[PDB]
Design an enzyme around this catalytic site. Structure first.
Site, PDB file in Angstrom:
ATOM      1  N   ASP D 165       0.858  -1.203   0.000  1.00 22.67           N
ATOM      2  CA  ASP D 165       0.000   0.000   0.000  1.00 22.67           C
ATOM      3  C   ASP D 165       0.881   1.235   0.000  1.00 22.67           C
ATOM      4  OD1 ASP D 165      -1.262  -2.205   1.699  1.00 22.67           O
ATOM      5  OD2 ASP D 165      -3.041  -1.018   1.151  1.00 22.67           O
ATOM      6  N   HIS D 192      -4.447  -3.322   6.105  1.00 17.29           N
ATOM      7  CA  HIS D 192      -4.290  -3.354   4.663  1.00 17.29           C
ATOM      8  C   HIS D 192      -5.643  -3.167   3.987  1.00 17.29           C
ATOM      9  CE1 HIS D 192      -3.116  -4.611   0.692  1.00 17.29           C
ATOM     10  NE2 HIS D 192      -3.891  -5.682   0.753  1.00 17.29           N
TER      11      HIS D 192
HETATM   12  N1  LIG Z   1      -7.273  -5.907   8.276  1.00 13.74           N
HETATM   13  S1  LIG Z   1      -7.834  -7.292   7.632  1.00 13.74           S
HETATM   14  O1  LIG Z   1      -6.761  -8.248   7.752  1.00 13.74           O
HETATM   15  O2  LIG Z   1      -9.064  -7.658   8.263  1.00 13.74           O
HETATM   16  C1  LIG Z   1      -8.173  -7.012   5.997  1.00 13.74           C
HETATM   17  C2  LIG Z   1      -7.217  -7.244   4.989  1.00 13.74           C
HETATM   18  C3  LIG Z   1      -7.567  -7.004   3.653  1.00 13.74           C
HETATM   19  C4  LIG Z   1      -8.843  -6.532   3.291  1.00 13.74           C
HETATM   20  C5  LIG Z   1      -9.192  -6.274   1.833  1.00 13.74           C
HETATM   21  C6  LIG Z   1      -8.498  -7.152   0.875  1.00 13.74           C
HETATM   22  C7  LIG Z   1      -8.683  -8.566   0.661  1.00 13.74           C
HETATM   23  C8  LIG Z   1      -9.615  -9.559   1.312  1.00 13.74           C
HETATM   24  C9  LIG Z   1     -10.619  -9.127   2.200  1.00 13.74           C
HETATM   25  C10 LIG Z   1     -11.498 -10.024   2.803  1.00 13.74           C
HETATM   26  C11 LIG Z   1     -11.411 -11.391   2.528  1.00 13.74           C
HETATM   27  F1  LIG Z   1     -12.222 -12.230   3.077  1.00 13.74           F
HETATM   28  C12 LIG Z   1     -10.401 -11.852   1.618  1.00 13.74           C
HETATM   29  F2  LIG Z   1     -10.306 -13.106   1.353  1.00 13.74           F
HETATM   30  C13 LIG Z   1      -9.511 -10.918   1.014  1.00 13.74           C
HETATM   31  N2  LIG Z   1      -7.828  -8.961  -0.318  1.00 13.74           N
HETATM   32  N3  LIG Z   1      -7.096  -7.840  -0.709  1.00 13.74           N
HETATM   33  C14 LIG Z   1      -6.143  -7.754  -1.701  1.00 13.74           C
HETATM   34  N4  LIG Z   1      -5.198  -6.899  -1.843  1.00 13.74           N
HETATM   35  C15 LIG Z   1      -4.422  -7.095  -3.028  1.00 13.74           C
HETATM   36  C16 LIG Z   1      -3.253  -6.157  -3.350  1.00 13.74           C
HETATM   37  O3  LIG Z   1      -2.624  -6.420  -4.393  1.00 13.74           O
HETATM   38  O4  LIG Z   1      -3.121  -5.229  -2.530  1.00 13.74           O
HETATM   39  C17 LIG Z   1      -4.841  -8.129  -3.797  1.00 13.74           C
HETATM   40  S2  LIG Z   1      -6.237  -8.914  -3.041  1.00 13.74           S
HETATM   41  C18 LIG Z   1      -7.516  -6.739   0.001  1.00 13.74           C
HETATM   42  O5  LIG Z   1      -7.025  -5.476  -0.135  1.00 13.74           O
HETATM   43  C19 LIG Z   1      -9.782  -6.307   4.306  1.00 13.74           C
HETATM   44  C20 LIG Z   1      -9.445  -6.543   5.632  1.00 13.74           C
END
Ligand SMILES: NS(=O)(=O)c1ccc(Cc2c(-c3ccc(F)c(F)c3)nn(-c3nc(C(=O)O)cs3)c2O)cc1
Ligand SMILES: NS(=O)(=O)c1ccc(Cc2c(-c3ccc(F)c(F)c3)nn(-c3nc(C(=O)O)cs3)c2O)cc1
Ligand SMILES: NS(=O)(=O)c1ccc(Cc2c(-c3ccc(F)c(F)c3)nn(-c3nc(C(=O)O)cs3)c2O)cc1
Ligand SMILES: NS(=O)(=O)c1ccc(Cc2c(-c3ccc(F)c(F)c3)nn(-c3nc(C(=O)O)cs3)c2O)cc1
Ligand SMILES: NS(=O)(=O)c1ccc(Cc2c(-c3ccc(F)c(F)c3)nn(-c3nc(C(=O)O)cs3)c2O)cc1
Ligand SMILES: NS(=O)(=O)c1ccc(Cc2c(-c3ccc(F)c(F)c3)nn(-c3nc(C(=O)O)cs3)c2O)cc1
Lengths: 331, 329, 331, 331
Positions: D165, D192
């Site tokens: 990010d 994230h």
């Molecule tokens: N703080 S937290 O750990 O609860 C959290 C982390 C991530 C997200 C949103 C999110 C998800 C995601 C969210 C919910 C799911 F159930 C799941 F399986 C995936 N994938 N992803 C990605 N980022 C990229 C990239 O290249 O940056 C490719 S995919 C993203 O930005 C929300 C909360």
């Protein structure tokens, strides 16, 4: 609260040993060329420098430290005390007298054997599991000496040997053929010095034997006088010493090439100084260069190069000369 | 039929494409040369000096390491035709101040050296960037600019790039952080009179001056001002100990060469013609953060300076111009 | 009084042309492996990507751009319009047809002719002086097709050819010998893939011919079955396709190695596909791999490898087959 | 009397553990982008790949092996059995399920717990002293999951968090300002993805605060709409997924940068997911990104960034939400 602890919360209080520490002993032009080359190749997480000239040692250390922003070696230390070398994976010895204009490397034996009698036991005390890479001259004789003094197994005592002579041979062959030296293959073996041996029978480009194409290759009858290329390899250090007073950059790059294979466990083949007892009928504990597989345990294997009868005779002459010196040393 | 012709069939019989020249093969020029070679910045490296044996020997020693490098042509000579079509020409030649010599007289001796070097460089590479490393670097960058007739974007002094690298090393040692993650800028004159910009000192965008308002002042119990004192004094110390400095300025200069040759548009504190800024009204070169790429300095950053900082840059400009106006070209 | 103008004083606006630009045509797995490998070797100051599927193309460009902080290629561009490719030093073609069930090889090659009659004149329009590196299969025929359509001189049209086949050979030889592939030498020449020719005489470590040590090498009378190394060069590619669906990483690294020699003018020797009429016994306009010297003008020279009767006949049979297809193509 | 024994004289039987080994778990697009970036940065002397899709796993391993000539990582291995991962310094986890139609975040996380209960105990068995780097999403919660299952201390469980990010932010700031992203500084912290926090106060070029220069920075009133740079960070990723189906290259490059700091003990600062309890009023076992010093032992220190009340409240709200999910997980 200090600024640092206002800024930074610490999780881990404890000191860990480095994982890939290299020591260079000797901060003359050769040692510092080895140091900068190793630094720019990202081979170490700690570099230690040792010498007995304390002001120059500290100055060289500081000058390297000031370039830290541009490097990926986060700790650079120095000291006359060998405790600064503890935990080294590889210790590169460059200390010793060097040959002046017109002087044989073989004229350095008494002085540099005596210097090694001080250095090697102190290196072994602080890094009992290191590999030793000897660069000081005459390097074949001093690799034998470092082996005898250290009590290390011979796989862990490696002389820079003819890695540089072979690089010079490939440079000169590339100049004649108009091919990068990476694509010009040919070995110089034996003494890193006047009795080295060009292995004409193995010279090739893209696996095409130059001797098969040109049967007089390397002989006195050769209309193209390729023996002059080997003569230029022999005379190289003398010419460069005559012109600029000493040599440094090429041997620094050669030593860094060897260090890369050792530190990264590559198992690349290099012509380095090692004991050749059992090859070519040689029975003496003589050290000189043959192609060796190099990696994280030092020399793990020797390549058995097929030599013509003339090439083998020259290699045995080199071995006789070196053993006549090495057999007279007293420990 | 020669061996070469038996072995190799030739398809065809060019101008250098990514060439760098280093002028001067003293310890600084050769440290620049080895650092540029081990960073693969050039496809051709030329060395020039007037000491012909030393020059040839340095060239040969580098050539013998060719197997270990990716720069396929290394040339040298006293004749500047060996420098033709250089993209970047790095000037490291110059006399050192001798016992008793005035600053004006040493500078004049280096002006006299540059009157030989710069026109010859310009003849053979009229579109190069000139990177001046010789000391006193800010004045000699002006000298090179005047003699060359180049536009100011193509005349660059190594300036405070190394002073800033030393600052970041010393800051990292204090904080236990790599210098890559310790940010801080030393601007103005290289060496004695350089200006640490305390407002910009930070880790992860956290201003140390805001956290610690005494930062940079004499009353600071933690004496952070000593970091800048050491930026100045550590150079003298290396010279006292080993006789000269070389490795850090080689790596600094290779840093600059990388941004120029690869057109990176990274910011570096290098010496540039600063007439117009900070109340400065003379033709003087001082370090400010400059965007560096294929046309040299295309842009610079306008750092917000305190009253005291601005007054320091103006006093430097006055001092440099005081010397420059006496020089005989 | 924009933030940018408050922060930055501009000294000049001059139209910049990239000095070391590379274009990759085709953003399937092969094109993108070539792109990432070239980016992580710092070979270009500008990378352009072209393909006909606009969404995928933009996505790939954006994903690479997002990693800019970690790279030293300051401009990455893309588009279906070839104007994004202007002033490239090197244009790498990975696009082309997929063979259909029941479709003859001739018909498949003709579809590639028709695709290249669009791609290649547009490349030439925008980069008249580039080198063309053809990676699309069938690579030896398509290198011919690109040469014919471009009108470029022979030296500037290069097929990736047997560069990867030779790298696979050296990997497999290194696995058998316990030596890094850098120190295991051997050349696969002729057609890429099924019909390639292992040149057993040139297989060596440290200049020692394995065929000399082991004369049964490469024959059916060999108890160690070294012939199996070349069988695996051919078959390992089919195997990777069977297991993961396609190959990509090794061809990306191969292609980046060719690009390094070209962009840096190294004059290293690589087995790449070149117009071989008049050499190696062949009389038609066909492209096959032989060891070629690569640098800033593309292929400046090639090595004349001494081949056995059987090897010579295989290259001649290949040439006959390629010409049999090429002579029926409609340009 | 084998050819190998005719060619090579063995000195040393023994074989040591690799000393700089990395394992990647999961050989989907993200895991293989991590693998190729780690290989082209020379960070490891051995790379292991693990997954349960056995054909794809073997195919990917072979494709990398075929590029060995171009690499300096002399051993690449793979398998479903975790014994291939033994003695890893760093284990990168990219495996896991993606959120499906109709799936709650809680139930997606629980399906990934169930997957990690297979993976993590096996990784810990064979490399009890490794650092775990979790790249799988949702990364902050899965970093907690890996920490709970492994029993590791918090310094050795690291989530890739906001490292990419922040790299995207710096790319976008560089585009706006016409400066390389290396010279554009700015930090995205917290969760994230959507809920991440742009720390406007730390955005700067050459130490010049953009917020002080342009006080409307990051506000709705800003005529230049710099807020939209952070929105683009939150959404350029969704955009890449829409266009090419997934993101891979930028992740791979940012993970290799993390791995470089860990493997080379650099003590560079990266915004990665770490256990944040005790900060910003947070009292639960939650992981969020803050700037962390990375080196040989993982996270050794955290930078305590000065946050506005609004920023701190955003992190606390994130922490409350994460704990609300975590407290319902079945381990
Ligand atoms: N703080 S937290 O750990 O609860 C959290 C982390 C991530 C997200 C949103 C999110 C998800 C995601 C969210 C919910 C799911 F159930 C799941 F399986 C995936 N994938 N992803 C990605 N980022 C990229 C990239 O290249 O940056 C490719 S995919 C993203 O930005 C929300 C909360
Ligand atoms: N009493 S003391 O502890 O100060 C001391 C002990 C040993 C020596 C031997 C010694 C060393 C030496 C010893 C250890 C090192 F780690 C090292 F790096 C270098 N170099 N050297 C010479 N060098 C040259 C040249 O031309 O370089 C010519 S003689 C020499 O004579 C001296 C003093
Ligand atoms: N007639 S001639 O061609 O032999 C000739 C022309 C120009 C000069 C000027 C000159 C140069 C010089 C000239 C050109 C270069 F490319 C170069 F690299 C260096 N260095 N130098 C001095 N250097 C030091 C030191 O302490 O290093 C002290 S005086 C000096 O006085 C001399 C001779
Ligand atoms: N702004 S200015 O151009 O007028 C100017 C710049 C620098 C200095 C001092 C100064 C000199 C120097 C020496 C003798 C002189 F006669 C002279 F004029 C200058 N060498 N040097 C070096 N710095 C290093 C290093 O590694 O940083 C190695 S030497 C340094 O810092 C004064 C004025
Ligand atoms: N001498 S020639 O030009 O006539 C020729 C070249 C190649 C082939 C066979 C062939 C093809 C292929 C693909 C689509 C076609 F329409 C076609 F005709 C051929 N792909 N490929 C690959 N090699 C790899 C690898 O990783 O090595 C991955 S795919 C391969 O080995 C036959 C003839
Ligand atoms: N009996 S077995 O050996 O074949 C076996 C053991 C454990 C697992 C767990 C497991 C893994 C997995 C396990 C280990 C890895 F190293 C790895 F990389 C991935 N992925 N995955 C799923 N993935 C998705 C998706 O939507 O991608 C949906 S379920 C899953 O359920 C499976 C089989």
């Amino acid at each position: 609260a200090t600024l640092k602890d206002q800024l930074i919360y610490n999780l881990l209080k404890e000191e860990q040993t480095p994982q890939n520490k290299i020591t260079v002993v000797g901060v003359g032009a050769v040692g510092m060329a080895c140091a900068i080359s190793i630094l720019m190749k990202d081979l170490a997480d700690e570099l230690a420098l040792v010498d007995v000239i304390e002001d120059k040692l500290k100055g060289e250390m500081m000058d390297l430290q000031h370039g830290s922003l541009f490097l990926r070696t986060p700790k650079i230390v120095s000291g006359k005390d060998y405790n600064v070398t503890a935990n080294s994976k590889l210790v590169i010895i460059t200390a010793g007298a060097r040959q002046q204009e017109g002087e044989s490397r073989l004229n350095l034996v008494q002085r540099n054997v005596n210097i090694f009698k001080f250095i090697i036991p102190n290196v072994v005390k602080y890094s009992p599991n290191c590999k030793l890479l000897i660069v000081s001259n005459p390097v074949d004789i001093l690799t034998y000496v470092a082996w005898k003094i250290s009590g290390f197994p011979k796989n862990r005592v490696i002389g820079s040997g003819c890695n540089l002579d072979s690089a010079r041979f490939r440079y000169l062959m590339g100049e004649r053929l108009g091919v990068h030296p990476l694509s010009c293959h040919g070995w110089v073996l034996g003494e890193h010095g006047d009795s080295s041996v060009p292995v004409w029978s193995g010279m090739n480009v893209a696996g095409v034997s130059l001797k098969t194409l040109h049967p007089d290759l390397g002989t006195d009858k050769d209309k193209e006088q390729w023996k002059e290329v080997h003569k230029q390899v022999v005379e190289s250090a003398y010419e460069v010493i005559k012109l600029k007073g000493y040599t440094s950059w090429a041997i620094g790059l050669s030593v860094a090439d060897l260090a890369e294979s050792i530190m990264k466990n590559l198992r690349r083949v290099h012509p380095v100084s090692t004991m050749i007892k059992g090859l070519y009928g040689i029975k003496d504990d003589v050290f000189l260069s043959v192609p060796c597989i190099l990696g994280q345990n030092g020399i793990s294997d020797l390549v058995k190069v097929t030599l013509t009868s003339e090439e083998e005779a020259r290699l045995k002459k080199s071995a006789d000369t070196l053993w006549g010196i090495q057999k007279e040393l007293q420990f």
